[PDB]
């Protein structure tokens, strides 16, 4: 489905952190610690990237597993149906633009 890998525990953290430091200025001020986390992990502090979304973004797509991954991510949706622009609009809650 669409924006469903809702790792609530992740999000609870993401929001609390923004509440404690909206500009991450303390992070800037504490490089010894800030440098311990990968920038990709830090992306998730501002970005809505849950551990699973991260795992998805890091998947290797190759010809050898393209169908396998399709079943892993889209499951029973026929790729032909998915391919229809209208289906996608709904699937991902996107505006026409």
């Amino acid at each position: 489905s669409g924006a469903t890998p809702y790792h609530d525990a992740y999000e609870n953290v993401r929001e609390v952190i923004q509440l404690q430091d909206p500009g991450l200025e303390q992070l800037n001020a504490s490089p010894a610690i800030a440098g311990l986390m990968h920038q990709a992990s830090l992306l998730g502090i501002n970005a809505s990237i849950s551990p699973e979304l991260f795992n998805i973004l890091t998947e290797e797509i190759t010809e050898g597993n393209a169908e396998e991954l399709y079943k892993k991510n889209f499951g029973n949706i026929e790729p032909a149906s998915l391919a229809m622009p209208e289906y996608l609009k709904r699937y991902y809650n996107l505006s026409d633009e």
Partner: protein, 48 residues
């Protein structure tokens, strides 16, 4: 651990935020996995 460190105003802000995000997630899931075919639910408005 982190939640416990918030003040009241922040906690209320947090809870409101999270509930809104939770709804979008529950709704998206519901439509795909729970909604029954007889109900032509193709959107959150239809879900409503």
């Amino acid at each position: 651990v982190l939640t416990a460190g918030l003040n009241s105003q922040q906690a209320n802000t947090l809870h409101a935020f999270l509930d809104e995000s939770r709804s979008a997630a529950l709704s998206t899931y519901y439509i795909r996995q729970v909604a029954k075919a007889a109900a032509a639910i193709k959107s959150r408005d239809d879900l409503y």
